[PDB]
Design a protein around this ligand. Structure first.
Ligand SMILES: Nc1nc2c(ncn2[C@@H]2O[C@@H]3COP(=O)(O)O[C@H]4[C@@H](O)[C@H](n5cnc6c(N)ncnc65)O[C@@H]4COP(=O)(O)O[C@H]3[C@H]2O)c(=O)[nH]1
Ligand SMILES: Nc1nc2c(ncn2[C@@H]2O[C@@H]3COP(=O)(O)O[C@H]4[C@@H](O)[C@H](n5cnc6c(N)ncnc65)O[C@@H]4COP(=O)(O)O[C@H]3[C@H]2O)c(=O)[nH]1
Lengths: 104, 104, 104, 104
């Protein structure tokens, strides 16, 4: 019923959207919000970054409280098997389709 | 400036679109339309398909019975260096951006 | 069972590959090869390009000087419903999986 | 000068990798690891998920511990302007390229 752009505008407001085909398998997508993080937190606290990246941040920014790093918003899918797929991609099919709806 | 949804609606209409934010200059994206091709043509006439795929089509359809295979519409990018990138992908930043403009 | 990297090398040599889960649906992916096209052919002959792009090519190459425009190689998918999806894109799951198989 | 497949195996080991060909300067990609999270932490503690998804999880899992939800590994890009792009996806050019180098 909706185009992919309308779904995108619904995602940016924090809603869960889906294509009609996905309903049988119960899949939906949602947006994880952008955030800005201080470099000291990235180096010393964040669990979910590989050590090499944290070392790079220390090499360049050097554990400053003032220095901040932007982490972009992105799309995630609640896939059929229940797991959360971070970094969801729109296929050509998905982009050009008009069977998008809002789950919640 | 438009949303990616509005850029997509332009693309479906035949328009060339780009993002001001894109680092490269002169880069734009366009949509190539959908076409249904007869199986005999796919196996014999088409030179842009690999031999394994053509063999598969021949095994399945036998170049007979007026069988036709749809090839879907897809986005493509005229990149900075003049090459045409078939099958352009929208990055999270692209999908969520609102600095899209029509180029033609 | 192969990694996505091995799947890719097999794609570059013209093979049909798939993930094991895809088998029930019958899906597979393959590479369409790259090719350079003369701009007069693009402007005057190619059916699968939109008018605006043909005009851009005319205005920027002149349909003269034997200018050749490259069209990159790219992946496509034979999808569940039989149609050929141009411009297949790998999910995060696809890229990081090691359940890839050669189909042909 | 490595394949995307070799870059991917380096990314699985936690390294930072990149392409010489990329237009912007100083960019690289890295993998954020897979994690499994108890549903009560997802509902009551995680700040970076929309409230609609927290609601969905609570309605389906009832705020129970030892009910866990997997969050997949995924690729991220340290972009040219210093922001981290969550959910980086490979373009046809990136996948089929052989100019990959280990940054760290
Ligand atoms: N918006 C945003 N915030 C982020 C990002 N990366 C880290 N953060 C912030 O840093 C906090 C600490 O991260 P952590 O990796 O040390 O522990 C995180 C992480 O271990 C886990 N988690 C949440 N989503 C995850 C995910 N998608 N993959 C793996 N782990 C995840 O839950 C913990 C608490 O999440 P949270 O969102 O409330 O707080 C994050 C979050 O607020 C990010 O990429 N985007
Ligand atoms: N809409 C559509 N039509 C297709 C597709 N694949 C093949 N076709 C049709 O079959 C014709 C012959 O394909 P070819 O490979 O033998 O020669 C093609 C091909 O060799 C070349 N060409 C155009 N775009 C190309 C490209 N992106 N990559 C490689 N070659 C390309 O131009 C020729 C003529 O294109 P066309 O659009 O006028 O006719 C196509 C086209 O109408 C397709 O994926 N989508």
């Amino acid at each position: 019923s909706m185009t992919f752009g309308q779904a995108l505008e619904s995602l940016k407001r924090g809603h869960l959207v889906a294509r009609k085909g996905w309903n049988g398998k119960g899949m939906f997508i949602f947006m994880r919000p952008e955030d800005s993080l201080p470099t000291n937190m990235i180096v010393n606290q964040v669990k979910s970054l590989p050590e090499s990246f944290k070392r790079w941040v220390a090499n360049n920014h050097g554990d400053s409280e003032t220095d901040r790093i932007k982490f972009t918003a992105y799309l995630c899918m609640k896939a059929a098997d229940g797991t959360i797929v971070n970094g969801w991609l729109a296929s050509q099919t998905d982009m050009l389709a008009n069977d998008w709806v809002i789950v919640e």
